[PDB]
Structure formats: structure tokens, C-alpha cells
């Protein structure tokens, strides 16, 4: 006992397990329940101040497997664990889910074996996966390991003798390796016959069992440990799919444990705590010349989070559990739920105040989530505190969040008009390699930002199942040489499949001062995916296939602004030359002007391009009751599917809107959400009456 | 008439637009059908030199739009086309179909306004889509465009007025543009009231009616046209997961022509015609600088063959043509159809003559598909003649094709075990950046190889509906600072989506003198996808966590080596430092050999991590029985399919395999292959009588 004499019991000797994993600069993985209730405990102080929590807010259960490899709800005392890969269900009443939300929570033990995944660990993280993805609920990973186990067959390692080319000579080399008949018995009585494959021969009258193939009786060894690795990297990749998937990197991921993070998509990294693959050493080893100096240099947050491999970064492990927590806020309680509504002091009903203008940069976090300033607080788009920004050390042309709106939670991706630097840094294999900053322009989408934006398409859509609001910005997509070699059409695709794949409403709004040219329009265009998408321009807004100048280049040329002279300008209509150098300065303007003219939100609702033109210190309310309408009718459109066997969005919808009473506008959004919510039981009626379907 | 007195009519001449396009450097859209024909013919050649063709082996028929807006076959003079955009169906008679084989054909005309797109070409080329989709058909698209359509209101061009600060001074500015009462009289009188939308003011004692937006009366001019490319965007995001899509770089293809090359994913690119966004002078005047030179540095086949954009480059349009004409040669003749067999000279029936050697230099493709030597041709695993090499200017250190085994079609992923070299041009926006010369390691993942290995998986899978075969041979993935920074995961991860997504056969095999290790070995795993994957192992492959020199630094350390020397070493059993320094070298092979014993395919048979181990020399036969055995369980699988409600794949298959007779081997594939194909009628009559079911 150290130290003797304290108040309370000595956690770490009374389970020295709990002292190893603080040695290894992390939690003690029966501890981080308790993480998880103190996350919580602050998710309602930060909620409402005055709230009284009882501990049975939150309950954690231990799930382990039975006599049947049937996972079960267990009480017992940590460190029990006879295998190094653990499991609680835990069941924890929310701001968002005050009756109650459930999720699992998987994670090595460092302390068992080094975290290592051995078939055993592998076959419980799988059943845990899939515990649940049956269940629809979120699984949380806790990332503390060193990889796949690696062993040897122990056994053979003081039987084992060598066939010498030279027995007086041991440096001149040997042919094989091989067992005498005390060496094989020794195997025959400990049971351990099959742990070894040999060839029986006779030399110089001894008998010779040589080794053709070393198995080993323990389990855990090599190959099998890759199968289980295999096993759970597909798993985690279906899990991502189907169910809300987050990883914490704890202490050290390596290797499947590096491929995990990745595969279950989000990612929180605590600093100093690296995701490598072959470790630093091991490549100097096979490099032949000390080229790395640590792992932290391979997989540390400065390589991760840069990266976009890491969604975020913690300053410790309980900094990492409330940014879990607080993700999961945004995130339904179980798949195919509804998003959780979560109304706070700043409701709907106000304009929004933050508005940028040409003449001056601003930051788009402002028009998102407001701006503080001496003159008073400048609400946004979106609910005072509720912007909550990921990959933010990747790709800051684009800028990526959940968010809130009224209290309804969203994805929402925003334009960075500023102009964005990123260090490449030098490569430590490469001494004729210098670290490299890239400038990219601002409202240009470059490879990074654009698979940034796919990405963040894809998490919002998969397991999150959040609506989503793009406020679009971009001129076009990086065309020049090095973009265009790096793959820019390869990354902006991916968003047009991002887009396609999307299962819940879509707004694309092109802001005051905003604008969408050429390609970045093309990619956003709502008939990508007609069923979700609808776009909105500002009054404020700029679009068209080209900017004025390039409009201008094409068609309104040198002997059209000549006949425009001739029209316009009496003294015009040599002495023509030293008037048209005095005259085109001007004239190119009027030209620019009017193909601006043509670039308006007017034109865009006149040609059926947009649902609506907007005044931005109104879209609050108008995307408020927009989004709560089309919700609702999401919902009751899923409701009709169930009872059908075959109709289409279009027909269903349809059929919906003819049981609205004749007096309700269709176009009133707040009308069709305020009615739909007020007969939901009465709607119910009807789709169960309509179960008198005998279709084949 | 030029020139004159030629045999034959002047076709140029005849029809002027066939001499435009060729001006343009392009075949004329009307002359493609023929390049199909010549191609095909070729093929047939190629198969059976003494095949007699007649003409009524291919038919040709163009698809135009009816009064209803429904696609209809026309048989019309060239150059009639009303619209930009112009579609043929093509009946043709194949070797791999004799019977016949079709598949549409889209394609830009660049003589209609310069291939550029406006809304009623967007919206045939999205009817063309829709309509291959339905019949499960390939669309062939070929790209000689323009991008998104632009233009101007030209009939306000000559109407427009100007609101001068001082009249008599038009360099001083002007407040707005707008019109006159004669100028509105002029648009009321033409029907073009709609073209602009005005504010009346009195100025002065005159009205003047201030334009606020100008629409236009004519369609195609701006936003409209940006509809239309996201339309066909989506609609080709969508192909590509459906029906075979592949895409001929004709003449330039510009913006949306760009993004269709790439969602469509399978392109030829003919050699210098490029695939671009924004244009290199427009570029320029956006960076106020002479940065670029030419189109060519933008996109060119050196940017888009060396990033895998483009998947071939083809010399000309009808080496472009031939290359479409052999990828589809491998592929079903629609959607959900059996892969084409296609039986040629070269016979399962042989065993495998080149074999790869630990201490010499081999190129894969001698594996795949034979070498020829002074003492003749060695064949390799595949049939002779049948590797189709796909994206071979990127990531070099993958190969991948298409090839035959005995005549079955299948996608082949092998590893380049030679160092390859690839240039990163220089940035000619940067005056500080030089062209970088990369070096990548053989057997060793990078995100450029890891990218290129996902993307054929995808593309075997997607469209082409092929089995695979990848000959695994990766020691693991790059884990260095660089390619951690560059998201060697992500490209790793991809694999993994790739293989749960696969719905053919998959066959991994681990070849002679190849290796599978850790990170490699987990990302190919057969529990990624046990429905569909199976792996092998040559009896001269190796696998294990690490190599020997890994596994020794963790598990045989110092002290187990000098416990090795006691037990081994009579003169070991000061004086024990310079004995040590004497043994070592040799001990550290001993224990490198103990490792090397554990890493066989007989360890991985007895941990039942490979469905077998192989012989090289036997792989072709048996991989053709295994595979030919493995499509028809495939069939009966997909048959009982239909006729259940709910029943899992062991389920399927342990009911088709119960109808065997009970004589017959259920692991001898040439015996399952053999009963089936005599009984597919027999087993039709049982599944029609299993239509007995009434599951709700
Ligand atoms: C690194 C970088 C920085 C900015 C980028 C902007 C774009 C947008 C397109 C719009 C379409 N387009 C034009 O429409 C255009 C804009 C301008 C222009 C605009 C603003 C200032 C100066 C010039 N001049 C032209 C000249 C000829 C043809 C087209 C134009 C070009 C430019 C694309 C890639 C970029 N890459
Ligand atoms: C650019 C590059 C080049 C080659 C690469 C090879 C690997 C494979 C792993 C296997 C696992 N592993 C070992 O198992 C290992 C191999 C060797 C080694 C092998 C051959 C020659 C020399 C050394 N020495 C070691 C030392 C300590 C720990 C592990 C080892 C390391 C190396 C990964 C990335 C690489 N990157």
C-alpha cells in the first residue's frame, strides 16, 4: 500500500490494473463509465442550471458474453475481464432524450495483454458491432491498444535443436531445424502433438524429426489474429452504414486499431496519443537509417486532425467524452427515429441580425452562429450556442457542423471567404525535401475542401440521418494544374454521390453576397437528388455559368460595345480611335453591368432554377417552418411506403396532400406543419384503415 | 464543290458538318456508328479469322425524341439533328455474343453550336440514360464539347439607355441601365414583354423604366443550363452503379463535359484532346498573370492518364472506339445477365509454365498472362492474349485488368514488385516549385496504390459485374510521416467498403514467393465479405503479424537467444562476451528460421484462415473449376432468392446443395460444376414447384 494514510481507499491498489493504465497516460477503462456520467451530469447543467440529477439518470451496465457467447448484463468488479476487450450498455436520460437514450460503449483494456486484439477480443468487439446494429443504437469505441496479438510457439523454443553443417563450426550455417524422439515425446505427453508438422529422417544412425511448419497449442499467435482484424474492419465498415459510429483515440491505436478509427468514420484524438500503422522504429529498422524520431510524428494530431482523420481533438480523455456527448446531441436516440428536437432560449421568431456585406470580410461562423460585438450580441442563421464544428483542422476553405434551427438539429456546411494556408511538412525520408505552404483562394473549391464537403455529406446522411443546409458560395472548382493532377474531379464527384445517396431534406441557400458559378452550381443542383433537394438564392445573390467579365469575353465583344458607342454616344456616332480609348473604360463597365443583370435571383425564380428568392434577415423564420413542414411530411410519405407495395415519391405525396382540408395552402409551410401535428392519431386512423391493400 | 473530279461524292461537301468537325480535330457524331462498325469487324478477326461477316451483323439505328418527348429509332439523313445531342442503338453479333449484344450511344455534336449544353440537350442525354438503365443496357457516351450553354438577352442589347452622372462627360459613371417607352413598345410589340423586369421613374419630365433584371426570351442563356448539367450529373452518378458506363474523350470536353468523364468513372482519353474546367486564359486573366500555355497543361493525357481519370489514352477516335468495343467484350450483354464466356485456344486444361523466383527481378503481368522467351511462350495463369490492362498510367505498383480463365471473364488485381518511379509536375502558378520525383517501394500500399486497388474492386463490381481475383502480395501499407499526412487510411479504408460492397466471386490468393502481412492482410481478409470472398495461399507464400526480423525484435529477444546457446552451444555451456560476439550472427538466423516456420500455408490451413493451400504450377486448374462451380451455385443462390420472402445465403445453399445426389462430392467443384449444368432445367422444374409458397 502507496500512499498509506489517505480519507478514502487507494483505487490503484486496491486493482493495480488501474495503475498501469494511468502509467500509460490514460483512463483505466472501468473508470470511463463514470467519464460518461460526469459528461452527461454537465449536458444538463449547461442545459438548465437548475435541474436536479439522481443517479438513476444514468445507468451503465457491463455486457460480457455467456456460457452460449450470448452477450448478457453483468455486476461484478472491474478487472475481471478475461479477455482485453470490454463492453457497457449504458442508459442515460438527456436534455434532448429526457426519458431516456441508450448506446454501447466498446473498448480495449491496456492493461490486458497491451491492448492487443486477440481472435477472442476480435470476436467480442463483433458481437458488441453487432448487439448494436440489431438494436439501431450508437456504438462508441474507445481506442487503447498495440494492434494484432504476436506470439510464438513458447513450447517448441527449448525443444528445438539444429542441424549443423559443421557441429565444431556453428558460424559456417545450418540446413534445418528439427526435434529428437525426447523432444517428440515431450510434446506427446503435455498433449501438445499437432503444435508442431514434421518430416521423420535418419542421419548418422540418429533419428531427426524435422520441422516443416511451426503451429504452436496456444491460439493468438499470427494469421488468426489477422482474420479477427479482418473480421472487425468490415464489420465497422457496415456498422457506419446503419447505426450512429464514434471512435475515442485514448492512448495509442495501432494498426487494425488505426484502420478502426477510420472505418467507424468520426474520430476525437486526445493530444499525444498517435494512430500509426508500423511504428517508427520498426521503419527506421526497415529504412536502414534513423529517420523518424517518435510515433507522435506518424500519427500524432498535428498529422490526424490536419488530415481530416481526426474529426476533432481533446485536451484529455473526459475533454473527449463530453465532445462524444455533445455530437451525440444532435444524433436520434436509435436509427430511424426522428432527429431530437431541442428548443432553447433563442427561438425562431426573431430576423437574423449578423449580415456580411461586399466591401468587407467576414467570417462565416458569424452568419451561422452569430457574432459578439460591443454594441451587443449579433444572432446568426442558427440557435446562440448551438454550432457545433468538426473537422475543423482539415480543409478550412469549407466549414463544416451540426447546428440547430428552432431546435431542430441539421447539418450544415458554410463557405470560408478567406483566403487559407496549410503547412505540408517536409518529408523525414527525403533529405532534398523542404516543408511547403499552400495558399488556396477562398470561395474556390480545391481537392481537400471538396472531399471535406462529400464527406461531411456522407456522416451527416449515415447514422446521424440529420437533415442538412449547404449555404452555397463557391465561384467554381480549382482548374489550374496542380489541382486538376491532384484529382479535383475525382473529389467534387464524390459530392454529386454524397448527394445522391442523401435520405433527408436538403437546403441549398446561395447567401446575400454569396455566389454559384459553373461547376460548383452543378454539383449542388437540386435535381441531383429531386426527392430531398430544393435550392433558395438571396435577393443579395449572384449565378450564372460565368462571372460578368467572362460573360462579357464571350458576348459582349469588341464591335458590340463599338455599335453600343454608336448608339449611345453622339460624339462617336482616326478621330474614332482617341474616342473609343476615352469611351471603353466606361463602356466595359455598362457591359459588365449588363451581364450582371442577367445573374439575379429574379432570373433564377423566373426560369424555375430555385424554389424561392429570400431576404436573409428572414430566412430564419422562413427555414424554421420549412424545414418543421417538410419533416412532417417525410414522416407521413415513410408512414405510406410501409402500406403499398409499389408507388412512387411523387404519387405518394400526392396522396398525402389530398387529405389536407380544401382551406389549407399546400405553400403555407407552417399551415401543413401546424395541421399534420395537430392530427398525427387522426392520420394514423387513415394509414391503418388503408391496410385493407391485398396487392401481388 | 472541293475538290473536284473525285471517284466517289465528297461527304464534306454533301454534308458541310462532317468538314467542321474534322477542322475541330474530331470525327463527325454521324460517322461513329461506322467507327463501331470497322471495330467490331476487328474483333471478329482478331477471334476467328475466317468468319464470314455480313452487314446485318451490326445495325446501327438512331434514337430521337417523338411528339410525347419518347425516344424512338429514326433512320434519317446526317446532320438533321435539331438539338446538340445525338444517340444511336447498336445491335451488333460479337464473339462472346453471336446471337447479338446492344448498347446506346450518346454523344455531343460539336458542330451544334460547339458541343456546348443547353436544357434540351441535357435532356435528352438524361432520356438516353434512363432508357439504357430500364433494358440494363451499356451507354457509351462520347465527349467532343463545350461545357454549360452561355449566352445574353441580344434583344435588349440595342434597347438599353444609360443613366449618365453628367451626360456630356460618360467617363464620370452612370447610376443605371434601363429602357424607354419605345423600347418597351419595341419588346410589347415582338411578344418579349417578359424579357426584363423594370421600375418606371419620371426623370426630368421623361419616363424611364430602370431594368432590374434581364431574363431574355431566348432559353439556354445562363442558370437554366446549370439545371440541366446537374440533372445529367446525378443521372450519370446513377448509371454508374446500374449499367455499364463508359465515356471517349473525343475533342475537348469542358465543365459538365469534364464532370460526366468522371461519373461515368471508365474513360479513353484520345491524345490531345483535354479534359478541363476553366480554360488556361481564363485562368490567366483571373490571376493577372500569363501562368498557363495551353488547354493541354490543364488537362491533357499526361495530367488525366497520370491521374486516373482516364482509365486508356487512345491514338485516335477508332483506337478509342476498339478499346470501348474489347472492355465490353468482358462484360454481360445487360444488367444482371451471365459474365460472357468466352472459350479461345488456350484451355484450362494445362498447368501454369512461368513461376516467379525469390532471388529474380519478375513483372506480374508474366503471371497473369504468360511471356514470351527464346524457347517459347510461358504461360501464366491466365488465358493467352486475354489481359486487358486498365488505369496502367497510375499508381503503377497495382496492376489491374481484365483477363479469361478458360474463358471466363473475370477483373485480376496483381502487385508490382519492381520500385516505381512517378513525376509530380511542377506548379507553374509557384516560381518556387520544382517537378518532384517519387519513389515508391514494391509490395508496399501507398494512398495512390491503395486508391487505384478500391477503384478497380468498385469498377469490376459496378456496371461490368464481374468475380475477381487479387494475387496479394503487400508486406503492408506505407506508414511514414507522408504518406500518414497524405490519408494513406482513407485509401486503405476504401478497400474494405469496396469488398462488403462486392456481388461476384472473389478469389484472394497469395502467390509463390508472395507475402501477406498486418495491415495488408486485414484489408483482403475473407470475413470482410464471407458471402462472396474465399482465400489461398501458395505452399511458397509467406504470412504472419510481421515479418521474421519483427517478430524475433518482439518475441526471440537477447535472453532467449543466450538460453538457446546454453541449450545448443557446448563451449557457451569475460570468456562468455567473446563467445556471444562469436554465435550471434548465426543464432540471429536461427531465430529468424524459428519465426519463418510459423509464417507457412500449412499454419494457416490449421488455424482455418484459407480455404486451401496451393501448388502454383495447379492453380489455373483448379481456380477455373472452383470459379466455374462457384458461378452456378451463384445462379441456384439468386434463384431460391425469389421465392422465399426471408432465408439466409447458408440457409440458400445448404437447401440447393441438399438436391445434389447424395454420391456427389460437395468440395469437388468439377462434380458440383458438372451435375448442374446437366440438371438446369431439372432444377428449374424444382424451384417453379417450390412457387407453392405463401409467406406473409
Ligand atoms: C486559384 C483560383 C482562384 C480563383 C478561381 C476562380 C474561378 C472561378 C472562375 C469563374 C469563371 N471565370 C470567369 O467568368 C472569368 C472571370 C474573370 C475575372 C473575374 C474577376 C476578376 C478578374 C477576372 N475573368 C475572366 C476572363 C475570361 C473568361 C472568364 C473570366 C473564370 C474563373 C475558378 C478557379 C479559380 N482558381
Ligand atoms: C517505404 C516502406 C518500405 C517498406 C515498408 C515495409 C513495410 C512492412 C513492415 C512489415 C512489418 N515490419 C517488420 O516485421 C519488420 C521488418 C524488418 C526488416 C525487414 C526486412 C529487412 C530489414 C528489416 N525489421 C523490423 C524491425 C523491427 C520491427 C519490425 C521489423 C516492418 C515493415 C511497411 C512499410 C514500408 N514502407
Not at 72 to 84: K, L
Request: some cysteine.
Amino acid at each position: 500500500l502507496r500512499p498509506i494514510a489517505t480519507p478514502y481507499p487507494v483505487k490503484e491498489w486496491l486493482q493495480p490494473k488501474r495503475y498501469k493504465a494511468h502509467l500509460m497516460g490514460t483512463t483505466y477503462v472501468y473508470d470511463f463509465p463514470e467519464l460518461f456520467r460526469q459528461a452527461s451530469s454537465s449536458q444538463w447543467k449547461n442545459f438548465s442550471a437548475d435541474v436536479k440529477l439522481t443517479d438513476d439518470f444514468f445507468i451503465s451496465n457491463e455486457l460480457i458474453e455467456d456460457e452460449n457467447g450470448e452477450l448478457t448484463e453483468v455486476e461484478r468488479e472491474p478487472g475481471a475481464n478475461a479477455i482485453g476487450m470490454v463492453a457497457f450498455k449504458i442508459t442515460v436520460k438527456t436534455p434532448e432524450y429526457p426519458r431516456g437514450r441508450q448506446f454501447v460503449v466498446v473498448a480495449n483494456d491496456i492493461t490486458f495483454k497491451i491492448g492487443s486484439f486477440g481472435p477472442q477480443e476480435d470476436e467480442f468487439f463483433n458481437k458488441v458491432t453487432e448487439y448494436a446494429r440489431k438494436r439501431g443504437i450508437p456504438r462508441i469505441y474507445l481506442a487503447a491498444n498495440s494492434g494484432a496479438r504476436i506470439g510464438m510457439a513458447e513450447e517448441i523454443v527449448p525443444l528445438f535443436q539444429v542441424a549443423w553443417n559443421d557441429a565444431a563450426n556453428p558460424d559456417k550455417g545450418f540446413q534445418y531445424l528439427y526435434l529428437t524422439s525426447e523432444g517428440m515425446e515431450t510434446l506427446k505427453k503435455f498433449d501438445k502433438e499437432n503444435s508442431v508438422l514434421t518430416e521423420r529422417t535418419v542421419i548418422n544412425g540418429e533419428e531427426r524429426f524435422v520441422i516443416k511448419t511451426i503451429i504452436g497449442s496456444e491460439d493468438g499467435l499470427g494469421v488468426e489474429c489477422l482474420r479477427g482484424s479482418g473480421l472487425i474492419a468490415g464489420a465497422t465498415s457496415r456498422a457506419y452504414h446503419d447505426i450512429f459510429t464514434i471512435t475515442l483515440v485514448t492512448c495509442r491505436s495501432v494498426g487494425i486499431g488505426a484502420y478502426l478509427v477510420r472505418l467507424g468514420q468520426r474520430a476525437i484524438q486526445v493530444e499525444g496519443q498517435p494512430i500509426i500503422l508500423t511504428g517508427a522504429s520498426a521503419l527506421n529498422k526497415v529504412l536502414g537509417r534513423e529517420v523518424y524520431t517518435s510515433n507522435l510524428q506518424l500519427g500524432g494530431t498535428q498529422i490526424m486532425y490536419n488530415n481530416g482523420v481526426s474529426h476533432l481533438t481533446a485536451v484529455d480523455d473526459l475533454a473527449g467524452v463530453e465532445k462524444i456527448v455533445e455530437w451525440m446531441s444532435y444524433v436520434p436516440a436509435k436509427r430511424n427515429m426522428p432527429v431530437p428536437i431541442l428548443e432553447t432560449k433563442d427561438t425562431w421568431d426573431r430576423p437574423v441580425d449578423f449580415t456580411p456585406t461586399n466591401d468587407e470580410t467576414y467570417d462565416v461562423r458569424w452568419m451561422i452562429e452569430g457574432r459578439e460585438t460591443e454594441s451587443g450580441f449579433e444572432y446568426g442563421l442558427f440557435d446562440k450556442g448551438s454550432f457545433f464544428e468538426t473537422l475543423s483542422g482539415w480543409a478550412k476553405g469549407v466549414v463544416v457542423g451540426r447546428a440547430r434551427l428552432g431546435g431542430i438539429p441539421l447539418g450544415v456546411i458554410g463557405v470560408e471567404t478567406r483566403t487559407v494556408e496549410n503547412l505540408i511538412p517536409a518529408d523525414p525520408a527525403n533529405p532534398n525535401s523542404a516543408e511547403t505552404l499552400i495558399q488556396q483562394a477562398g470561395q474556390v473549391w480545391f481537392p481537400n475542401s471538396a472531399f471535406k464537403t462529400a464527406q461531411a455529406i456522407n456522416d451527416f446522411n449515415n447514422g446521424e440521418q440529420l437533415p442538412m443546409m449547404i449555404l452555397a458560395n463557391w465561384r467554381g472548382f480549382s482548374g489550374g494544374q496542380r489541382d486538376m493532377f491532384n484529382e479535383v474531379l475525382k473529389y467534387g464527384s464524390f459530392i454529386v454521390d454524397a448527394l445522391v445517396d442523401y435520405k433527408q431534406p436538403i437546403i441549398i441557400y446561395i447567401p446575400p453576397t454569396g455566389e454559384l458559378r459553373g461547376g460548383s452550381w452543378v454539383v449542388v443542383d437540386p435535381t441531383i437528388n429531386a426527392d430531398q433537394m430544393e435550392m433558395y438564392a438571396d435577393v443579395n445573390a449572384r449565378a450564372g455559368v460565368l462571372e460578368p467579365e467572362g460573360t462579357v469575353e464571350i458576348k459582349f465583344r469588341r464591335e458590340k460595345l463599338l455599335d453600343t458607342m454608336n448608339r449611345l454616344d453622339d460624339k462617336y456616332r482616326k478621330q474614332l480611335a482617341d474616342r473609343e480609348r476615352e469611351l471603353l473604360p466606361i463602356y466595359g463597365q455598362i457591359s459588365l453591368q449588363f451581364a450582371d443583370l442577367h445573374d439575379r435571383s429574379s432570373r433564377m425564380v423566373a426560369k424555375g432554377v430555385i424554389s424561392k428568392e429570400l431576404e436573409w434577415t428572414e430566412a430564419r423564420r422562413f427555414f424554421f417552418w420549412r424545414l418543421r413542414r417538410r419533416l412532417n411530411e417525410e414522416y407521413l410519405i415513410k408512414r405510406l411506403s410501409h402500406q403499398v407495395g409499389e408507388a412512387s415519391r411523387l404519387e405518394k405525396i400526392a396522396r398525402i396532400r389530398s387529405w389536407y382540408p380544401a382551406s389549407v395552402d399546400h405553400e403555407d409551410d407552417r399551415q401543413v406543419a401546424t395541421w399534420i401535428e395537430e392530427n398525427y392519431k387522426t392520420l394514423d386512423d387513415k394509414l391503418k384503415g388503408l391496410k385493407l391493400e391485398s396487392f401481388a
